[PDB]
Design an enzyme around this catalytic site. Structure first.
Site, PDB file in Angstrom:
ATOM      1  N   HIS A  95       0.806  -1.219   0.000  1.00  0.00           N
ATOM      2  CA  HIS A  95       0.000   0.000   0.000  1.00  0.00           C
ATOM      3  C   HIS A  95       0.850   1.285   0.000  1.00  0.00           C
ATOM      4  O   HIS A  95       0.287   2.364  -0.152  1.00  0.00           O
ATOM      5  CB  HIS A  95      -1.073   0.010   1.111  1.00  0.00           C
ATOM      6  N   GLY A 152       2.256   5.745  10.587  1.00  0.00           N
ATOM      7  CA  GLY A 152       3.685   5.612  10.325  1.00  0.00           C
ATOM      8  C   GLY A 152       4.246   4.251  10.727  1.00  0.00           C
ATOM      9  O   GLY A 152       5.360   3.896  10.332  1.00  0.00           O
ATOM     10  N   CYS A 200       3.179   1.205   9.800  1.00  0.00           N
ATOM     11  CA  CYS A 200       3.058   0.187   8.756  1.00  0.00           C
ATOM     12  C   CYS A 200       4.435  -0.280   8.289  1.00  0.00           C
ATOM     13  O   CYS A 200       5.337   0.546   8.094  1.00  0.00           O
ATOM     14  CB  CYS A 200       2.216   0.703   7.596  1.00  0.00           C
TER      15      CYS A 200
HETATM   16  C1  LIG Z   1      -7.250   3.945  10.983  1.00  0.00           C
HETATM   17  N1  LIG Z   1      -6.910   4.086   9.579  1.00  0.00           N
HETATM   18  C2  LIG Z   1      -6.911   5.267   8.964  1.00  0.00           C
HETATM   19  O1  LIG Z   1      -7.167   6.322   9.535  1.00  0.00           O
HETATM   20  C3  LIG Z   1      -6.550   5.248   7.472  1.00  0.00           C
HETATM   21  C4  LIG Z   1      -7.526   6.045   6.616  1.00  0.00           C
HETATM   22  N2  LIG Z   1      -5.915   3.988   7.032  1.00  0.00           N
HETATM   23  C5  LIG Z   1      -6.574   3.352   5.883  1.00  0.00           C
HETATM   24  C6  LIG Z   1      -5.872   2.081   5.459  1.00  0.00           C
HETATM   25  C7  LIG Z   1      -6.532   1.161   4.645  1.00  0.00           C
HETATM   26  C8  LIG Z   1      -5.923  -0.020   4.263  1.00  0.00           C
HETATM   27  C9  LIG Z   1      -4.638  -0.276   4.688  1.00  0.00           C
HETATM   28 CL1  LIG Z   1      -3.884  -1.788   4.271  1.00  0.00          CL
HETATM   29  C10 LIG Z   1      -3.947   0.619   5.476  1.00  0.00           C
HETATM   30  C11 LIG Z   1      -4.562   1.800   5.881  1.00  0.00           C
HETATM   31  C12 LIG Z   1      -3.810   2.769   6.774  1.00  0.00           C
HETATM   32  C13 LIG Z   1      -3.747   2.231   8.203  1.00  0.00           C
HETATM   33  O2  LIG Z   1      -4.678   1.613   8.707  1.00  0.00           O
HETATM   34  N3  LIG Z   1      -2.682   2.666   8.912  1.00  0.00           N
HETATM   35  C14 LIG Z   1      -2.451   2.524  10.296  1.00  0.00           C
HETATM   36  C15 LIG Z   1      -1.857   1.404  10.875  1.00  0.00           C
HETATM   37  N4  LIG Z   1      -1.732   1.191  12.191  1.00  0.00           N
HETATM   38  C16 LIG Z   1      -2.201   2.122  13.009  1.00  0.00           C
HETATM   39  C17 LIG Z   1      -2.820   3.322  12.579  1.00  0.00           C
HETATM   40  C18 LIG Z   1      -3.327   4.298  13.473  1.00  0.00           C
HETATM   41  C19 LIG Z   1      -3.932   5.426  12.998  1.00  0.00           C
HETATM   42  C20 LIG Z   1      -4.053   5.644  11.631  1.00  0.00           C
HETATM   43  C21 LIG Z   1      -3.575   4.730  10.735  1.00  0.00           C
HETATM   44  C22 LIG Z   1      -2.946   3.535  11.177  1.00  0.00           C
HETATM   45  C23 LIG Z   1      -4.481   4.140   6.765  1.00  0.00           C
END
Ligand SMILES: CNC(=O)[C@H](C)N1Cc2ccc(Cl)cc2[C@H](C(=O)Nc2cncc3ccccc23)C1
Ligand SMILES: CNC(=O)[C@H](C)N1Cc2ccc(Cl)cc2[C@H](C(=O)Nc2cncc3ccccc23)C1
Ligand SMILES: [Cl-]
Lengths: 301, 297
Positions: free
Chosen positions: B41, B135, B137
Site C-alpha cells: 500500500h 507511520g 506500517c
Molecule cells: C485507521 N486508519 C486510517 O485512519 C486510514 C484512513 N488507514 C486506511 C488504510 C486502509 C488499508 C490499509 Cl492496508 C492501510 C490503511 C492505513 C492504516 O490503517 N494505517 C495505520 C496502521 N496502524 C495504526 C494506525 C493508526 C492510525 C491511523 C492509521 C494507522 C491508513
C-alpha cells in the site's frame, strides 16, 4: 490506537553484555568503552555472603583471576577497582559496539526496560517500574545478576539499574551504575525484607488519561476534589501521596483531554470506592501503575 | 521468581529496519540480504499502480545512507524492492506463518527507526491487540529460535475497534482482511484456552496456588463449559503440549481444567493470579517453560 506495556528496543544494550567469572561464580557484566561493570558479589563464595568484607576479599585478587567473555572472545583484564557495590574491570579492548550512554539514578515511580541475561547472553526484555519501597517486580532466575535496566529516549542509552539480589518475597533489589543501592538494602545474605509497598498514584492518573485519549470515559464523574481530600482517601487504599509536582507533571495530559487533574483525581477516588463493576480500562481489570506521564505521552497519539 | 510479559531481544531485527518513501507516503521496510520488504500500500489495482512506477520513485533510507533500488516486484500484499547493497547486518532468518494462539514480539517502528518492543498473540479472530500509530506500517513481528530470527508478521492496518491486521512476510494476510479503505471489522474474539492453562501453571511455579482444587474433569465436559464462556476448544494436542508443565507441578492437565472451570463459573472472588484480576491468554506453554528456565539468544 492500543496501549501496551512497551519496552525500548534492546539492541544497543545486547552489544554490551558480557560474562564475568571469578572462581566458581559466573554472572553478567556491562562492557562500555574499556570497562566492564558488574556486581561486586562476584568475588564472594556462598559462605562469604553473610558478612563479606569486600575490601579484604578484593585485595587478594589479581587481574588474571577475573575471566571476562564477550561472545566467543576472551577479554584481558588489565585493572580493577570497586566503586560502592559495583566492580569495575578495566579491559584491554574498547567495546566497538559501545553506544552513546549516560549513568542516571532514578526515583520511585520511574519506569525502565530490563534486558534479562544469563551467562552474558540476553534472553528477554521487559518493562518495569521502581516501586515506592525501592524494589522492582522483575522476572529473574539464578545467574541473572548483572542484568541491566535502561531507557533510550532519543539515541542515548541511560543506564539506571543493575540487578544484585532477590528478596524473600520474590521481588528484586539492585543498584544504579555507580554501585549505590536503591532502598535500604545491602549485598549481604543477612535478614532483609521489602517494606510495605504502595501504588504509584501519579502513574495510575497518567494511565487513566491514556484511556481517555484512546476513547474510554466510562469512569469519569461530575465531581472534583481538593488535593488534601484526595490524599486522605488515597492513603486509605495504600496509594502514594500525590504532590503538587505530580499535578504539574500531569498538566499536558490534562490540557490535551480537557479533564483537570483534580477532576481525574475525583474519578480515581470513585474507582477505589466502587471497583470496576465487571468493566475493564485499556484491557485491564486492575488500576495500572507502571506507566509514567512521560510514557503515556510517548506512546499515545 | 517473577513473571513478566517478555519479548525476545530485538537487536537482530533493529539492524534490518529501513524507511521506505513513495511520493507522499512514508513507512517501514525490512532489509534482508539485497531485498527490502514493505506493505504494497506504500504505492486499488496494485499491478496498474506498480507498472507506472520506476526504481527511482522508491526512496529507501538505512540510517543516514540512501540505498539504491535496482528492481521491484509484488508478492501477494508485500512489495519487494531489490537494492544494490546486501545488508551486512542480515541475521540467520526464516519466514514463518504462525497459527492463532501463537505469540511473537513486535518491534514498533516509525520512519525506519525502532521505538519500542512488545509481546503479543495472534488472536483466534486473526487480529493482534498491538499499540500502533500512523507511520507504523511495515513494523514486524518475530520469534527467535536459537540464533535464527523467524519473521511472522508485517503490520498493514488498524481496524475501527483499535485492533490490528497484517500479513506474513510472503504477503498473505492473517484473517479475512484486504489492504484497502473499505468497511472491514474484526470478528467476535475468543480466549486462547491452552495459553490460560500454561499461565495457571506459571502461577503455580511462582507460588500462587489458591485456585487449585481436588477435582478433575473429562476433556468433553471441559469443552462443553469452555464453549459457554467463549473459550477456544482444548484439543488432545494441547493436553500433550502441557505435559511437561503438568509433570513439573504435579497437577494433571484435566486437574488444572477443573480449576479453570471453577474460575469461569465463580470468578476470582477479589483475588489475583500473578498480579492480574483477569485470566491471561498471551503466554504459550513454550513461553512459560522458556521464562521459567532462562533460555538465551
Ligand atoms: C485507521 N486508519 C486510517 O485512519 C486510514 C484512513 N488507514 C486506511 C488504510 C486502509 C488499508 C490499509 Cl492496508 C492501510 C490503511 C492505513 C492504516 O490503517 N494505517 C495505520 C496502521 N496502524 C495504526 C494506525 C493508526 C492510525 C491511523 C492509521 C494507522 C491508513
Ligand atoms: C534467593 N536467593 C538465594 O537463594 C541466594 C542464596 N542468593 C543470596 C544473595 C544474597 C545477596 C546478594 Cl547481593 C545476592 C544473592 C544471590 C541472589 O539473590 N541471586 C538471585 C537474583 N535474582 C534472582 C534469583 C532467583 C533465584 C535465586 C537467586 C537469584 C544468591
Ligand atoms: Cl527519575
Amino acid at each position: 490506537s492500543g496501549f501496551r506495556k512497551m519496552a525500548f528496543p534492546s539492541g544497543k544494550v545486547e552489544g554490551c553484555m558480557v560474562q564475568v567469572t571469578c572462581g566458581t561464580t559466573t554472572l553478567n557484566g556491562l562492557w562500555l568503552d574499556d570497562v566492564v561493570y558488574c556486581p561486586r558479589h562476584v568475588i564472594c563464595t556462598s559462605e562469604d555472603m553473610l558478612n563479606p568484607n569486600y575490601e579484604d576479599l578484593l585485595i587478594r585478587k589479581s587481574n588474571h583471576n577475573f575471566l571476562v567473555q564477550a561472545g566467543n572472545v576472551q577479554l584481558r583484564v588489565i585493572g580493577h577497582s570497586m566503586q560502592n557495590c559495583v566492580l569495575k574491570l578495566k579491559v584491554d579492548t574498547a567495546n566497538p559496539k559501545t553506544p552513546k550512554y549516560k549513568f542516571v539514578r532514578i526515583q520511585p515511580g520511574q519506569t525502565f526496560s530490563v534486558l534479562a541475561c544469563y551467562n552474558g547472553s540476553p534472553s528477554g526484555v521487559y518493562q518495569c517500574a521502581m516501586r515506592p519501597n525501592f524494589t522492582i517486580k522483575g522476572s529473574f532466575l539464578n545467574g541473572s545478576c548483572g542484568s541491566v535496566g535502561f531507557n533510550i529516549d532519543y539515541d542515548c542509552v541511560s543506564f539506571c539499574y543493575m540487578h544484585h539480589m532477590e528478596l524473600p518475597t520474590g521481588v528484586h533489589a539492585g543498584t544504579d551504575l555507580e554501585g549505590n543501592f536503591y532502598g535500604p538494602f545491602v549485598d549481604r545474605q543477612t535478614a532483609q525484607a521489602a517494606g510495605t509497598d504502595t501504588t504509584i498514584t501519579v502513574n495510575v492518573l497518567a494511565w487513566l488519561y491514556a484511556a481517555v485519549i484512546n476513547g474510554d470515559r466510562w469512569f469519569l464523574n461530575r465531581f472534583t476534589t481538593t488535593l488534601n481530600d484526595f490524599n486522605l482517601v488515597a492513603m486509605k487504599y495504600n496509594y502514594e501521596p500525590l504532590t503538587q509536582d505530580h499535578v504539574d507533571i500531569l498538566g499536558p495530559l490534562s490540557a490535551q483531554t480537557g479533564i483537570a487533574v483534580l477532576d481525574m483525581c475525583a474519578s480515581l477516588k470513585e474507582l477505589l470506592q466502587n471497583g470496576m463493576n465487571g468493566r475493564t480500562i485499556l484491557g485491564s481489570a486492575l488500576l495500572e501503575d507502571e506507566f509514567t506521564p512521560f510514557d503515556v505521552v510517548r506512546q499515545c497519539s
